[PDB]
């Protein structure tokens with residue numbers, strides 16, 4: 180799932196992109212670092228989970 | 230395999246007046262002998278539309294244009310030079326981009342993360358040995374991955390051969406993206422008109438409802454090239470272009486009064502709020 | 516349900532009047548157009564001493 184996006188989606192809009200999300204004021208030149216997160220995160224589904 | 234185009238003579242953008250154009254059937258309900266008031270994204274009447282002209286006399290123009298809340302597209306043809314459209318936001322493999330191409334043997338619609346060239350084009354080759362043409366250069370994209378939607382029509386063929394004289398076919402389209410549905414309306418009509426948009430009224434029928442989910446802000450057209458022995462040089466200069474033309478307008482949220490005749494064909498329309506007289510006509514539903 | 520002369524386009528399934536009620540339908544089994552005319556009609560007056 181996507182955790183960071185510059186803006187909300189439109190209805191039935193798909194945004195498969197994987198560019199680095201600039202949380203901070205500084206460009207990140209598509210690298211991972213402070214205030215430069217990856218937008219894609221995943222779930223850890225476990226059979227023992229709530 | 231792409232190649233930039235170099236022998237270009239630049240001009241200011243031409244403009245013409247859209248004379249009662251941009252009307253499509255707002256829905257799929259049959260009505261007849263009725264004046265129906267509907268509000269939708271229509272091309273304003275008598276509006277100004279940008280005119281690009283592919284000609285060699287070499288002047289051809291396939292810029293990237295904004296997709297402002299839907300686009301009215303029209304073209305005048307004699308040799309099927311305009312064969313497709315590219316829609317997206319960055320057109321550089323970072324996002325998904327809709328590609329519609331008619332490559333003479335298959336209408337292909339794809340939504341994919343295309344890496345597009347700086348100047349997408351197709352190309353047809355003169356054969357001096359026999360009086361027959363064929364399509365031999367396919368260059369719109371360099372790569373394609375994370376491809377999502379794809380459609381290919383039936384196989385076919387069409388006369389891509391060079392004609393001369395006056396243009397014969399007016400092909401009007403409406404392109405809108407509503408809640409993830411890329412809706413294409415179109416109308417084909419025969420003409421005998423050489424320079425500007427014909428004056429008249431013709432309603433655009435739905436054609437589709439492509440579920441793409443693409444955030445579309447810009448688009449580009451796709452023009453084919455004539456390459457011949459009469460055109461010397463490399464791939465970047467060794468070409469000519471057939472004569473044709475296209476017009477680009479933009480849709481706005483407007484109320485129209487639409488006239489359905491006894492056969493259910495829309496024969497006229499009033500753009501409400503065009504001017505005080507149109508407002509009066511709208512008020513009286515006549 | 517009666518026969519009709521309304522030439523529906525391939526994408527049209529129903530016709531409507533200005534009041535938005537259904538006028539005609541395309542039969543899904545046989546691609547013919549049928550008009551829908553409400554049965555009840557006319558007025559009744561009662562004369563009584």
Ligand SMILES: C=CC1=C(C)/C(=C/c2[nH]c(/C=C3N=C(/C=C4\NC(=O)C(C)=C4C=C)C(C)=C\3CCC(=O)O)c(CCC(=O)O)c2C)NC1=O
Pocket residue numbers: 309310311312313314329330331336387388400415436
């Ligand atoms: C590009 C996407 C594209 C669309 C949306 C499209 C729609 C379209 N074009 C058609 C006819 C046709 N369409 C074309 C060619 C074109 N007409 C155009 O609007 C354009 C841009 C071309 C390409 C140059 C021709 C030559 C015919 C047949 C005309 C004839 O009867 O001779 C038809 C009728 C098919 C039938 O007979 O059942 C459809 C649905 N064709 C396409 O290629």
Ligand SMILES: *[C@@H]1O[C@H](CO)[C@@H](O[C@@H]2O[C@H](CO)[C@@H](O)[C@H](O)[C@H]2NC(C)=O)[C@H](O)[C@H]1NC(C)=O
Pocket residue numbers: 185186187188189318444445446
């Ligand atoms: C659809 O794409 C457009 C263009 O990429 C997005 O608008 C841009 O949003 C960024 C946000 O930082 C701005 O900096 C740009 O100036 C905007 N450009 C334009 C032309 O508006 C738009 O937000 C996208 N829509 C969605 C839902 O993602």
Ligand SMILES: *[C@@H]1O[C@H](CO)[C@@H](O)[C@H](O)[C@H]1NC(C)=O
Pocket residue numbers: 244276277
């Ligand atoms: C828009 O159309 C009008 C026609 O009345 C024209 O004068 C004007 O120049 C057009 N817009 C531009 C930017 O040229």
Ligand SMILES: *[C@@H]1O[C@H](CO)[C@@H](O)[C@H](O)[C@H]1NC(C)=O
Pocket residue numbers: 490491492
């Ligand atoms: C409606 O269709 C019929 C075909 O039976 C045709 O004769 C008539 O002229 C059409 N009406 C209009 C206004 O075109």
Ligand SMILES: *[C@@H]1O[C@H](CO)[C@@H](O)[C@H](O)[C@H]1NC(C)=O
Pocket residue numbers: 544545
């Ligand atoms: C069954 O479907 C076909 C369409 O393929 C139609 O022609 C036929 O009339 C249908 N059956 C009946 C009983 O109408």
